[PDB]
Amino acid sequence: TFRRLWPTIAPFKAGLIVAGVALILNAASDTFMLSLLKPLLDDGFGKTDRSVLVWMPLVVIGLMILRGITSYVSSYCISWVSGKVVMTMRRRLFGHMMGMPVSFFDKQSTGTLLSRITYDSEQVASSSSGALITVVREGASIIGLFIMMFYYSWQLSIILIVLAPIVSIAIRVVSKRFRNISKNMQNTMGQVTTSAEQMLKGHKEVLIFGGQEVETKRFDKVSNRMRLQGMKMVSASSISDPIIQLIASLALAFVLYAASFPSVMDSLTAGTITVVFSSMIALMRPLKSLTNVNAQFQRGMAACQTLFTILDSEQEKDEGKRVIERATGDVEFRNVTFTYPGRDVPALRNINLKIPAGKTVALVGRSGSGKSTIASLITRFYDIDEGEILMDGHDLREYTLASLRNQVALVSQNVHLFNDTVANNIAYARTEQYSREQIEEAARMAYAMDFINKMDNGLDTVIGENGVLLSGGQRQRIAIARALLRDSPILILDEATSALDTESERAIQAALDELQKNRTSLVIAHRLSTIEKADEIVVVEDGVIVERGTHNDLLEHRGVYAQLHKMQF
Amino acid sequence: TFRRLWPTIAPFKAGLIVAGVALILNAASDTFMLSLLKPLLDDGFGKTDRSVLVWMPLVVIGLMILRGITSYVSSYCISWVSGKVVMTMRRRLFGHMMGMPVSFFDKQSTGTLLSRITYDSEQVASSSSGALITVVREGASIIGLFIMMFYYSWQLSIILIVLAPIVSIAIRVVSKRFRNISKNMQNTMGQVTTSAEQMLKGHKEVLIFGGQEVETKRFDKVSNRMRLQGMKMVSASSISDPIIQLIASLALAFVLYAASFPSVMDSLTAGTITVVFSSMIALMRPLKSLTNVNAQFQRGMAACQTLFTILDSEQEKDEGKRVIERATGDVEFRNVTFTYPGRDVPALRNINLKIPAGKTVALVGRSGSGKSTIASLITRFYDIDEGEILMDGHDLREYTLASLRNQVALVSQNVHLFNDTVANNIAYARTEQYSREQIEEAARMAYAMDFINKMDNGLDTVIGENGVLLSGGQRQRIAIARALLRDSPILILDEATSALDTESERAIQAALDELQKNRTSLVIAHRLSTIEKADEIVVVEDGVIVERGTHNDLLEHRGVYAQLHKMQF
C-alpha cells in the first residue's frame, strides 16, 4: 500500500532475516514434535520395546528448549527492528512539529500530538511486524503439517483434504437457512413486544374506566402468544447444531469406512493414522490467523498515512532573506487587518499603532478581543491577512524569521521552564554565546538572587517541570532575567495580574522597571500601575482603535480610559 | 432455586426431570465416543483385523444422532419450563402494574417498564436454566470421563492427576513474577512519555527563543530512553511464555518416563494410552465451564429481586368505605393543599372552589402553573396532602375508588384508544351492560357517525394503535361518544387543542356543547369560546386563586382574566 516506509526499514534488515530463520525453526520444531506420535504408538507403547520411551522423554524437552530459544531469539530481532524504525520516525515527527506555524498547535490538535509520537507511531510497527510474524511463522507450520501427511500416508491425506471443502460448504449452507428463519421469528417476537408496549401505555385510562379485569384478560392472550413465539425461537435454533454436527460426522464415518476396508489402504499401523488425523486439527490454528494477515497489514498502515500527513506538511513560511540586527526605530502597524485561521469573524480590524523610539504604548482595555492578537503578530506566530507592519523602514515579511524572533521578548505570566539547570533556562539556546559570568549579573539585576540562594545545590538545580517547580512570581523573574540577558530591544509585557500581593508585587515591579530602560515595549494592560505611567494610551475595542489619545487628554475626557477608571473603582 | 421463585416452577417440574435424563445421555454419549479409540488403535488399524472398522462407521453415526436427539429433546423440554415460568410471572407483573398508583408510572419509571416484563423477566430463566444445563451436562461428562480414565490403566491416571495441581501452581507462580515485572517497566515508561509530552508545550517559547536544534538534540536523547525501555518490556514479556511452556513439558517427559517402568508397562498398549491422554484434554472444557455455575445463578437471581421489588410494592390506597351511585350534588375544594410526590416545592397551595349544581367552572390560566393537577385530585390519581375535597357532603377518601372514578369523564385530546374495534372502545369495560342499540345512539349524538360509516368495515373496525390510526379530532370525538354513553355526571374538559379549522372546530364544539347538558364540569381552558361562556371564571396564580369572581366582574377589571384577553389579542 504505502511502501514509502521501506527505506526506513532498509538500514536494519538483520532482525527480519534472523527472525525469518529463527521463526521457521519455531514452526518446524512443532511439526517435528507432533511426529513423535508415530514411534510412540508403533514401536513404543504398543510394542514391548521399552527402548523407544527412554530416548523420547529427552527429545520432548529437547524440542521445547528449542521452541523457547527460537521464540526469544525471534523476539530480540523484531523488537529491535520494530524499535529502531519507530524511533527514527518518532524523532522525525518531532522535527516537523517544531518549526511549522503555531496555527496547528493552537486548536487543530492539542493533546493528540503525543498520541502520534507515542501511540500511532508504535502501531505502524506493532501491526506491520505482527503481520510478518503470522505470514512466516504460520506459513511454514502449514507446510510442515502438510509434508507430514503426504509422507506418512498420501492415500488417506487426499481423501481427508478432498472432504474438507464439502464439509465446510455443507455446514455454511445448513447454517444460513436456520439463521434467516431465526431472524424471521424474531421479527414477529418484536411485533408482539410492541403490542405489549402499546398495552402498557394506557394506565391512566385503564384506571378511570374500570377496565382492570378486562385489561388483564387481554394480557392472558398476549402472554400466551409471547411464549408460543418464544419457544419457537428455541425450537429453531436448537435444531441447527445437531444437524451440522451430524453433517460433520458423516464425513468422519466415510473416512473411517474408506480408510481400512479397501485394499488400497491398510498401509497404516496405528501411528500413521493418529499423526494424519492429529495434524489436520493442527492445521486449523495456522489457518484462522493467516486470513487476518491483510486485516492487520492494513490496520497498521492507515497509521502510516496519518503520520505521513502530519509529516510532509506546509512548514512555516520563512519568506524573505533580509537580515535585521537591532530595532533602532519603531515597530509600527499601518492599516493592517488579520483574522484567525479556521474562522471568518475578523478578530482584528484596521489598526494604526506606532511604537515610538525610547517610549512605550499600552494596549488598554479588558475587552479580551484585541490585546493579545496584536501582540501575536509582532513575532509572526500568526501571519497577517492584509496590510503592513513596518520595522526599521521595511516589512516583517521581508525579514528572516530567525532574525525577527530574536528581537522580541515576551515577559509573560504563563511562561515555560525547560528541564535543565536554573542557568540554561536563563540562557536558552545561547549557552555558548553567554558565559556564566553574564548569568550572575543577569540574575542579580533581575533580583532573582534571593531565590537562587535558597536552593539545594545553587545555580544548578533542575528547575523545569519534573523537578523543583516554582510559583508565578519566580517564573516571572526568570523570564525577566532571560529578557535582560538577551538584551532584546522589543518587549511585550503581558502583565497578567494574577496577584497584587505585597513582597511579590514589589519584586516584579522593581525587576520590570529595571528591564524597561530605553527598551521600546508594548504592554498588555491588566494592572492600572503601568496604565497610569505610559507615553501613549491606546484603547482596543473590537479592533477599532479610536480612544488613542494620551493618558492626560483621555483622562480629562470621559472616554474609555475614564470608563476604565469607572469599572476598576 | 430462590425459595420465593421455586413454587412457580414446582408444578412444571416434569420438564427438568425429562431434561435431566436426556442431558446425562448427552454427556454419556461423549464419553462413549472417546472409547472407540481403544478398539480402533488396538484391534483395528494397528492389528489390521479389517473387521472392527467396518462396524465402527455405523457406531460413529449411531452416537451423533443420539447426541442430537438428546440435544433437541433436552432443549425443548427446558424451553417449555423456561418459557412457562416466565409466562406465569410476566402476567403477575402485569397484574400489579395496573392497580398501583399513578405516581409509579410518571418519572418513577418509563417505557423501561417493558424492559421488566420482556427482558429482565426472561433473564431470570435464561440464566437459571443456563446454570442447570451446566451443572448436569458438565457434571456427568466429568464423571463419565473419570471412569474411562480409571478403567483404562488406573496406574497412569493417578500419576496424570497428581501432576496437574503441581503444573498449575508452577505455571501460576512463574506467571505472577513476569507480570508484575512488566507492570514495573510500564510504570517506568510513564516518566519518559511525560517528559516527551513536556517538550511539545513550549512551542511558543521554542520558536521565539531560537532553540530548535537544542530541543531536537534533546529528542535524540529522550527517544532512545523510550526505545531501550521499549525493548526491556518486550524482552520481559517474551520470556514468560517460553518458560511456562517448558514447565508444561517437564510433566509430559515425566509421564513418558514413568510409563517405562515394569509396573506401568503391562496394560497400556497402543490404545489405553490415547483415551487416557485425550480424555484429559476433553476434561478441561467441562471443568472450565463448571467454574461459572454460581456466577450465572446470581446474575439470573438478581433479576429475580428487582422484579420482585415491583411485584411486592405498595398498591393504591383503596380505603373503600362509602359507595355512591350518582354524584347528584357539588364537588368542592376547601383549604386543599397538595405537593407532588418526589418534590418539595408545594405545587398546590390553599384552594377554595365550589362546582355549582347545573353549572360549570373554567380554570382559565395560560401560566401553566399546575391547573391540570387540580383535575387529577378529583379522580384521585394523586392523593391530597392536606385539606378537604368534598363530593356530596363527604370526603373522597371515604368513597370507594371504584365508585368515585365511575363519576368522572376525561374529555381530552390525548385519550388512549385500545386495540379493540370501535364498538368496545366507546363502551370500554362496560360492553356487557351496553347493547349495540345504545352505542348507535351514542355515536349519533356525538356526531361521529360519518367517520365510522365512511370506514371500510363499519362499526366493528379495528380502531386502536397498530390498526387504522385515526386523527386527534376523531380521538376526542370518540372520547365524547364514550362519555355520552357512560352518562357520568362530572366531566373534565381538558380542551388542550385551541386550534380552529373548518369542519373540525365546528364539529367538536357541537359535540361538546351537546355533551354539557347539565353535567357539572370543570374545563381547563385554552380556547376563549368556552371562557366567554364560562359561568364562573377562576384563574390559577401559582397555588392561590386570588381572582374568584364571575365573568363580568373579571372582564371589567384588569385582574388577570382581562389580562389574559390582553395576551390573546
From Swiss-Prot, chains A, B:
Record-listed E.C. numbers: 7.5.2.6
Free-text activity regulation comment from the record: ATPase activity is stimulated by lipid A, hexaacylated lipid A or Kdo(2)-lipid A. Inhibited by the phosphate analog vanadate.
Effect of disrupting the coding gene: Absence of MsbA alone causes accumulation of hexa-acylated lipid A species and glycerophospholipids in the inner membrane.
Transmembrane segments: 52-72, 129-151, 156-175, 242-262, 264-284
Pfam families per record: ABC_membrane, ABC_tran
Keywords (A to Z) from UniProt: ATP-binding, Cell inner membrane, Cell membrane, Lipid transport, Membrane, Nucleotide-binding, Translocase, Transmembrane, Transmembrane helix, Transport
Gene Ontology annotations of biological process type: lipid translocation; lipid transport; lipopolysaccharide transport; transmembrane transport
Keyword set includes DNA-binding: no
Top-tier EC class: translocase
Effect of residue 526 to A: Lacks cell viability and does not support growth. Can still bind ATP and slowly hydrolyze ATP, but becomes locked into a closed dimer conformation
Binding site for ATP: 365-372
Localization: Cell inner membrane
Domain ABC transmembrane type-1: 16-299
Domain of life: Bacteria
Residue stretches making up the ABC transporter domain: 331-567
Membrane topology field: Multi-pass membrane protein
An example Gene Ontology CC term for this record: membrane
GO MF terms, alphabetically ordered: ABC-type xenobiotic transporter activity; ATP binding; ATP hydrolysis activity; ATPase-coupled lipid transmembrane transporter activity; identical protein binding; lipid binding; lipopolysaccharide floppase activity
Domain characteristics, as noted in the entry: In MsbA the ATP-binding domain (NBD) and the transmembrane domain (TMD) are fused.
Assembly and interaction partners: Homodimer.
NCBIfam families: MsbA_lipidA, PRK11176.1
Note: In addition to ATP hydrolysis, may utilize another major energy currency in the cell by coupling substrate transport to a transmembrane electrochemical proton gradient. In vitro, MsbA-mediated ethidium efflux is dependent on both the electrochemical proton gradient and ATP hydrolysis. Identified as a drug target. Inhibited by a series of quinoline compounds that kill E.coli through inhibition of ATPase and transport activity of MsbA.
Membership in a protein family: Belongs to the ABC transporter superfamily. Lipid exporter (TC 3.A.1.106) family.
Function: Involved in lipopolysaccharide (LPS) biosynthesis. Translocates lipid A-core from the inner to the outer leaflet of the inner membrane. Transmembrane domains (TMD) form a pore in the inner membrane and the ATP-binding domain (NBD) is responsible for energy generation. Shows ATPase activity. May transport glycerophospholipids. In proteoliposomes, mediates the ATP-dependent flipping of a variety of phospholipid and glycolipid derivatives. May also function as a multidrug transporter.
Protein's recorded name: ATP-dependent lipid A-core flippase
Organism (species): Escherichia coli (strain K12)
Source species taxonomy: Bacteria, Pseudomonadati, Pseudomonadota, Gammaproteobacteria, Enterobacterales
